[PDB]
């Protein structure tokens, strides 16, 4: 119960903190991680 609460906090923080840098090919990188968690 302590481990899966950490993993749930990791998977949510991995989405937002990947989607902020200065307008390079990150739109390609932000395309890929939402495709993995949902499909």
């Amino acid at each position: 119960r302590i481990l899966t609460h950490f993993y749930q906090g990791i998977v949510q923080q991995f989405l937002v903190l990947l989607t902020t840098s200065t307008d390079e090919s990150l739109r390609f990188l932000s395309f890929r991680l939402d495709f993995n968690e949902h499909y």
């Binding site: 990150l26 739109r27 390609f28 932000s30 395309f31 890929r32 991680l33 939402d34 495709f35």
Partner: protein, 128 residues
């Protein structure tokens, strides 16, 4: 003569191959209006060797065929496969992981409907 220099610079961008059709160009003669008409038959020939270079390597007609009526929509079997995948995804604006999937679905819808020339259809990009 301005448009003459524009077409000879296009072929010069490929390589240094053109020569003026006479061995020596003279305008210091009392006839001068028949010499700008042999200047106009010269840039017509520069158009013809540019029209050459369109028809040999570049395929302007195949480029306009691969874009335009296909861009309105010509062969919808490329697009109704992609329209199956506009009904599952395109309900909300794009997220950060969505445009990575949209190019994956365009290339999926390429070969399920059997494109005839693949380097003419990999030039499609996707607006955010």
């Amino acid at each position: 003569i301005l448009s003459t220099g524009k077409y000879l610079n296009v072929v010069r961008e490929c390589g240094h191959d053109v020569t003026c059709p006479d061995a020596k160009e003279i305008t210091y003669t009392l006839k001068e209006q028949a010499y700008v008409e042999r200047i106009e038959k010269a840039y017509n020939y520069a158009s013809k060797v540019l029209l050459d270079f369109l028809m040999e390597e570049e395929e302007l007609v195949a480029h306009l065929r691969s874009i335009k009526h296909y861009f309105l929509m010509d062969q919808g079997d490329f697009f109704v496969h992609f329209m199956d995948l506009t009904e599952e995804e395109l309900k909300k604006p794009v997220d950060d992981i969505i445009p990575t999937r949209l190019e994956a679905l365009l290339e999926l819808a390429l070969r399920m409907s059997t494109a005839n020339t693949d380097p003419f259809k990999d030039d499609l990009k996707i607006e955010l």
